[PDB]
Short mmCIF file of C-alpha atoms in Angstrom, two decimals:
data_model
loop_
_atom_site.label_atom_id
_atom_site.label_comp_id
_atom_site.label_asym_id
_atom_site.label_seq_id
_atom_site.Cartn_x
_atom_site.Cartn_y
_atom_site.Cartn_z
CA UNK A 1 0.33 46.86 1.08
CA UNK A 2 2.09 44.79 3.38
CA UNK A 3 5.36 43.52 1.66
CA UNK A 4 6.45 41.41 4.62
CA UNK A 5 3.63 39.32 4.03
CA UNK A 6 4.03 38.64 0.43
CA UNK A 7 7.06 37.44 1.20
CA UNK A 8 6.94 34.36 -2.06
CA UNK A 9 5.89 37.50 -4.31
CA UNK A 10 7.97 40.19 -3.34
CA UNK A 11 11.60 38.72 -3.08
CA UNK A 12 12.79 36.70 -5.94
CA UNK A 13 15.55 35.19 -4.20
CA UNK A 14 13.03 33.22 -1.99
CA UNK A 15 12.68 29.64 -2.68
CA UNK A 16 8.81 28.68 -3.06
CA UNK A 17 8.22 26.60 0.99
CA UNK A 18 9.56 29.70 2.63
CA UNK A 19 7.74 30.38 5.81
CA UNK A 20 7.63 32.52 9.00
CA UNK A 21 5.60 31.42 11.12
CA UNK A 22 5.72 33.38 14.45
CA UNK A 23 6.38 36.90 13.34
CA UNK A 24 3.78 37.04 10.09
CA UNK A 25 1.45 34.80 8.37
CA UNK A 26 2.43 35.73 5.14
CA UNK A 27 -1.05 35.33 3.30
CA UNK A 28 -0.04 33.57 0.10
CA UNK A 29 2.24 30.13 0.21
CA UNK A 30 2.21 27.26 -1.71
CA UNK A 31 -0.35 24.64 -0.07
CA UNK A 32 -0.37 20.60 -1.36
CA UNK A 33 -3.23 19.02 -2.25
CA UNK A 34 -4.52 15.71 -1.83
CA UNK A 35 -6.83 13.44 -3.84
CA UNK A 36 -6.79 9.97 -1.43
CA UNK A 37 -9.77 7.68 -1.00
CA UNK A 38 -10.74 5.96 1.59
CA UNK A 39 -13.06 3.01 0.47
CA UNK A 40 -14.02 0.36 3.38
CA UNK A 41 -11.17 -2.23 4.07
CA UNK A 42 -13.90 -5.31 3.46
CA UNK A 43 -14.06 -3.74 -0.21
CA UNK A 44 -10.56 -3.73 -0.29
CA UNK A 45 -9.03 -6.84 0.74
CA UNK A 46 -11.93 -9.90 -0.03
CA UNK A 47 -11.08 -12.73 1.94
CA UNK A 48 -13.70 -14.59 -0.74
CA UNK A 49 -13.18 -18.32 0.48
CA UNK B 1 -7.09 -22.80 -18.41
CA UNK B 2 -4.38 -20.23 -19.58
CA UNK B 3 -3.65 -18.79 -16.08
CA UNK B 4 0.30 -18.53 -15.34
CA UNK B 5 -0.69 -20.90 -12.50
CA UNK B 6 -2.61 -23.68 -12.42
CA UNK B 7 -0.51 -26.74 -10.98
CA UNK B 8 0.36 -24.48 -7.88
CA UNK B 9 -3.74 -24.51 -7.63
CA UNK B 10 -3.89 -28.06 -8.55
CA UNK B 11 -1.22 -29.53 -5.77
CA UNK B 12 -2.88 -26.91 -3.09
CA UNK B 13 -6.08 -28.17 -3.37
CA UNK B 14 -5.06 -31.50 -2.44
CA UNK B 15 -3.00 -30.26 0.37
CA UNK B 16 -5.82 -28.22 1.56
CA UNK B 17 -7.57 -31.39 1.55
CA UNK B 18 -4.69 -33.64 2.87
CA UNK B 19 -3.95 -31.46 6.20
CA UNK B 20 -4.50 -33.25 9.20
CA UNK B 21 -2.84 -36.25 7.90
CA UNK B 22 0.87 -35.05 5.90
CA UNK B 23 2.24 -32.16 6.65
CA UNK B 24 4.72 -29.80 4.41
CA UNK B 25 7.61 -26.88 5.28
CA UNK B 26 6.66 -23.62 4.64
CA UNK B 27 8.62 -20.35 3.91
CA UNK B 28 7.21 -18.09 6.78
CA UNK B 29 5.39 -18.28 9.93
CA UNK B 30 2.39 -16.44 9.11
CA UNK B 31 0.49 -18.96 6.20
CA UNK B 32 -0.71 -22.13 7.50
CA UNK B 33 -1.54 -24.94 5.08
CA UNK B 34 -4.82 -24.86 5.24
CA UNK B 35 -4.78 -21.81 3.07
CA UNK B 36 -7.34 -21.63 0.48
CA UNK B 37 -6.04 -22.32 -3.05
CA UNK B 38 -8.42 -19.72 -4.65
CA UNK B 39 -5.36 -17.42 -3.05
CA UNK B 40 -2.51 -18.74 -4.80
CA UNK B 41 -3.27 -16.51 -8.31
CA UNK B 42 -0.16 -14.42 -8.61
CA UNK B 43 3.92 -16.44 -9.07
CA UNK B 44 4.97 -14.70 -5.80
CA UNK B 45 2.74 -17.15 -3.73
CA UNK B 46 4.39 -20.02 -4.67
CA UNK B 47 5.94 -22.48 -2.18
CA UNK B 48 9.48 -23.62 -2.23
CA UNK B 49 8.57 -27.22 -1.35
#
């Protein structure tokens, strides 16, 4: 099994956002995560009057 | 009525109605007057004059 991809698993000294990006790909990373809306900006600001 | 501001609503209305004919300073140069006084709900919309 490829160790120098599982490069977050493998080497404790390695702070979590550790990347390579153009020798490997390293298959496993920590990835964010969103959970935004986007309503419709005349439901969001009225202008009622 | 037990809002936190009613006599900013109650001298807007009448300068809503009165512009045209006496004019007041403002603050900024984006509000105009004739701004609705439905709008005026929250202390940071208050005018300095």
């Amino acid at each position: 099994i490829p160790v120098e991809r599982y490069n977050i698993l493998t080497n404790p000294d390695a702070p979590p956002t550790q990347i390579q990006l153009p020798e490997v790909v390293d298959l496993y990373n920590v990835v964010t995560r969103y959970a935004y809306e986007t309503p419709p900006i005349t439901a969001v600001v009225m202008g009622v009057p | 009525t037990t809002d936190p501001c009613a006599p900013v609503k109650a001298f807007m209305t009448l300068a809503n109605m009165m512009v045209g004919f006496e004019t007041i300073p403002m603050d900024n140069q984006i509000y105009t007057q004739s701004r609705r006084a439905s709008a005026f709900s929250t202390p940071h919309t208050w005018p300095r004059c």
